[PDB]
Subunit: 280 residues, 4 copies
């Protein structure tokens, strides 16, 4: 199987309030809403019971009634204060002091969690479906390409092309090792349209003299990581992708995406790869 | 035409709620306000209809009246609760529980979007109108300069001078390639007033022995990117600019901006470039 | 004793509102809550006294009563406004203008402090209990390992292995010096499961020809720092750890954690270290 | 005079709502409060006038009275809604819809500006009062030192020592140039107590064979920049300082600050510099 999925995430399987902030960001929206709606009603229900424990302390409430106690809580906590249900004495007015404070502080935090979850940036970067190993500038070169899917530019953009493969030590240790493949240009200070990433395969490159045969044997994989500062979000963005030997087009050439000055960019041609065809 | 505009942005033309966070930051203020004002009234209108669906559940409302239902919603959602229009029974008080929560959470988020849009930092950096190619320290050197337009300093400031030009491969591939021009000083840990950026043209420089003639031929362009941590905003800032061959003053020398100790800085002289004039 | 504790923090002992923001983040939750609850009641108590200083300016209050004045403040500050206690005249309505503003601005800030304290990211990274000095790729190599304790990946992850030891200058100055040990791979662009960090001990390494004997003599310590961008938090995370000579297993080999494709990762084996046993 | 003050800021003198976000962060607290208090009253005053323009639309208001109109605004904007002054008809209830929204959005933003200004981190770093040029490891070395003034550590801490001095080009151009002095250790991944920063003066150092005489002549200055990630704030912090020739103690040696294991750190000795005294 694939050690790395095509989105860069790993295949491998792993083996209450300890990691609260992580879980409140990663848990699904249905759970998250429920969880907030849970705390909301539970806190009002606990405050209501305290109002009833004081005695008949809500001006137009039914004596010993939770419903009335509960709704007087949501009016105090939300700071609506219609004025039909109003507190009586020092205990009911102290609890109001405490509940108005709980309500103001608490909900403000729940809403910044909602915002945190909602204001997540995404690098609108599109990775080419395949990689090509063709001769460029008199040297076989491993290539792939990225494109921005938005008008806005990406500042100090850098890319990492990593070979991940099985190896055998000088002693006899069989381990998977990551190689960070040296690229002609790893940083593009302003990435706005398209970028073909090239790794010239030389006597220093870990894939020197390596054929499709030998790449499949070491179960070689190529993991790509793009990172850059987005202008639209004014935040740093990241994007990642992973390829296998089945996703390398030996001899393939990427088709030009820039048309016509009046210059254009067709993202149809983005995954288009040219190839010479030998005689049958 | 110009591949890069003078502000660094590219010329080239590209070819509902999928990219919500990006669009809510990039859409214009008139659209943004409308969009928030839209949701505001639409949510109150949907809550109003639910109050009417329960029956005569608003204490001083006209029966079957939306206006009354609607304004009781904006008083509940905004948590004003005047007390003339007050809820009756369990359904109207449940909807209030839900609407007070919707109103508190929702508006808090809309206001942090307003803040996000409003609290954007700008590197108050001014790029010189032209570049000069003059002999400095016994070597022709490509220069340009930046100035800070505020009192506050910029920490860990770095600049990238990138040559972008048409090239032909050893095979015959005609492609545009970016060169990151090596500068005498790419980082200024504390940038506060002015910085002349120099690229000494040597046998390693991509513009070695290159004249205005040959630079226009490869439709050469120079893209500059400034980045640094601003003290005033306590955030990182960035600024960018682009030049063409028409914006290079061969033999030009930048005029000194620092006057008189009692030292000064005249930003008039900032774009002023000295030049020798040959006999006619 | 240990110059560095096992969590990386130093042993050494050091020798009102000057550092407010730091202290409001570092002070304990019991102090922090008290401090907020303090300001809350103190501000309402100061506003109450001003209402009493105006005269009988609260519609259904007992004349000269602080309790009534105080609760009318918490209803104004929290913006509950039940309507039983309502202001009378220009002074009571001006103070309301001022208190509603104080209450809105103040509590909003107290809640973002609560959020700041609550939304702290933690690199769920587990450092191996020991380090090993075994021959890997025909060179004795100092190793240790890290593991991620969450599904979510860590982007642009880097690790620093620092030797900290007593030294004597060419003059005769006895000082403690930190060496940043060169690692085969200091950056893992995508760290998701496990990473064995290796420092090949060569004629350039500060621990060349160094035995347990000589390492204890210079009271050598090894400090590890992990840093990376977390996907779950969408923030940068950091983690650190420190070892002594008693925590180095000479000849030790880390046990493989990756089982079986159907690949797994047992974190039991994570601290497991294999060792050859000489004949007695 | 001093080109750079001792806090790193430059001496040199420079020569409505264009830079709003910068000015709202840099303007003084008295101006800032006034500015917010300004907008607050001005917005309520503009809303009041609109309520009066509708006619007698406030239930218990005096007809044609601004005071009453104004206070009904602050009760609507702050969302207090006591209920004595309540809106009448569609125009007064529409304006309430608009003002409750203006009040909720507006104040939320004003409070995040208050927070932004208040939650500024400071690197509690103390720079030594002087620098020393003494022989360390058989080479004259320019040194200075930093200390942390808090328990909490500073992660990925880096320091820049920059020589700033007057120079003359191979042509005859007299310019001030910054040299970034190469340090034995520019990065301390974990800075918690003290760090002596050393620049070994070698045939590559810009201050090679340079005496106090020649350093004063080129009006040499030394600018130091410290940057690092603070644990307490969970943010990056920075600190800077500048020295002149009058602040260099030729032959000086920094006194040890670490006492006694039971290790200590006396910050009294921090500025203490030892010196040999020649015979008179
Ligand atoms: Cl916020
Ligand atoms: Cl925030
Ligand atoms: K309210
Ligand atoms: K409110
Ligand atoms: K109310
Ligand atoms: K209210
Ligand atoms: K009311």
């Amino acid at each position: 199987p694939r050690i790395l999925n095509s989105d860069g995430s790993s295949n491998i399987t792993r083996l209450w309030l300890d990691d609260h902030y992580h879980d409140l960001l990663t848990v699904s929206w249905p759970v998250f809403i429920t969880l907030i709606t849970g705390l909301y009603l539970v806190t009002n229900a606990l405050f209501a019971l305290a109002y009833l424990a004081c005695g008949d302390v809500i001006e137009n409430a039914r004596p010993g009634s939770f419903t009335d106690a509960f709704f007087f809580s949501v009016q105090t906590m939300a700071t609506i204060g219609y004025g039909k249900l109003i507190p009586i004495g020092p205990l009911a007015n102290t609890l109001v002091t405490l509940e108005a404070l709980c309500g103001m502080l608490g909900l403000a935090v729940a809403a910044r969690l909602i915002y945190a979850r909602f204001t997540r940036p995404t690098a609108g970067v599109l990775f080419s479906s395949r990689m090509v190993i063709s001769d460029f500038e008199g040297k076989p070169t491993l290539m792939m390409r990225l494109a921005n899917l938005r008008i806005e530019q990406i500042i100090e953009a850098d890319v990492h092309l990593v070979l991940v493969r099985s190896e055998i030590s000088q002693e006899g240790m069989v381990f998977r090792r990551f190689h960070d493949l040296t690229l002609t240009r790893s940083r593009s200070p302003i990435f706005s349209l398209s970028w073909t990433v090239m790794h010239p395969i030389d006597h220093h490159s870990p894939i020197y003299g390596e054929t499709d045969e030998t790449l499949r044997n070491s179960h070689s994989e190529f993991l790509v990581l793009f990172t850059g500062h987005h202008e639209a979000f004014a935040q740093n963005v990241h994007a990642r992708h992973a390829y296998s030997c089945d996703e390398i087009i030996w001899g393939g050439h990427f088709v030009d995406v820039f048309t016509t000055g009046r210059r254009a960019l067709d993202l149809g041609k983005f995954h288009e790869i040219a190839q010479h065809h030998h005689h049958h």
